[PDB]
Amino acid sequence: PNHPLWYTLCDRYGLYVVDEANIETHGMVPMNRLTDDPRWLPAMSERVTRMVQRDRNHPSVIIWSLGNESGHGANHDALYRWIKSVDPSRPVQYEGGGADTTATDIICPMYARVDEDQPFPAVPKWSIKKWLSLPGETRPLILCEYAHAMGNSLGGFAKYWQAFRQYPRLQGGFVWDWVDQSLIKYDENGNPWSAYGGDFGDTPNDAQFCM
């Protein structure tokens, strides 16, 4: 959940917002170890319910998100239903566990390619055109993350947009991401320079992967 003023600005300047609960357990093994554990349901539910209770009147918020990279747990299904019950005005999405589980109204993969499949075991990232028509599937597809803009990047960006425009159910996505997470540091001469992972003695760290 963002600083309260962000939603007011989006309401006024006009930007569609996906409000996401502060829940990410990426480092767990497997990713859903905690989210599928009934003992963590209470902590998770407050992160979802208190978000909804705070931002439910903002017109800019058009979609609720259960969080990020926490696999797919029964806690997600429970909280998904909680929202649908409390606020039927907004669709609920969540990418964890395969991007098309029972906890999301929208097929929302991260980095699924336009034409090329990535048949990872359990959590495959199908070509987005193919994903749409898998037997039984009918939901819309909007990538929660795509076109990773790390450094000299965004190659193949036009391929996505040609697809978004030709396929009615391919409704876009959110580029990753807006601003480099670099921090300022000063050399002996007092001159500032852009720093990243490990430049503060922090270790282990993931170097430039924060930009």
C-alpha torsion angle, residues 41, 47, 48, 50 (rounded to 10)? 120
| Strand residues in the chain grouped as ranges (E) | 17-20, 61-65, 92-93, 141-146, 170-175, 183-186, 192-195
Respond yes or no: is residue 20 known to be catalytic.
no
Question: Nearest approach, Cβ of 159 to a second copy (angstroms)?
Answer: 12
Q: Which does 196 bind (CB under 5 to 8 A by kind): a second copy, Na ion, none?
A: none
Closer residue to a second copy (CB): 88 or 135? 135
Site string for a second copy, 116-135 (x = CB under 8 A): -x---------x-xx-xxxx
180-210 core/surface letters (b: 16 or more CB in 10 A; e: else): eeeeeeeeeeeeeeeebbeeeeeeeeeeeee
Instruction: Kindly tell me which residue out of 88, 168, 190, 201 binds a second copy, with binding defined by CB under 8 A.
Output: 168
Respond yes or no: is residue 116 known to be catalytic.
no
Residues that bind a second copy (CB under 8 A): 117, 127, 129-130, 132-136, 138, 166-169
Residues that bind Na ion (CB under 5 A): 164, 167, 170, 209
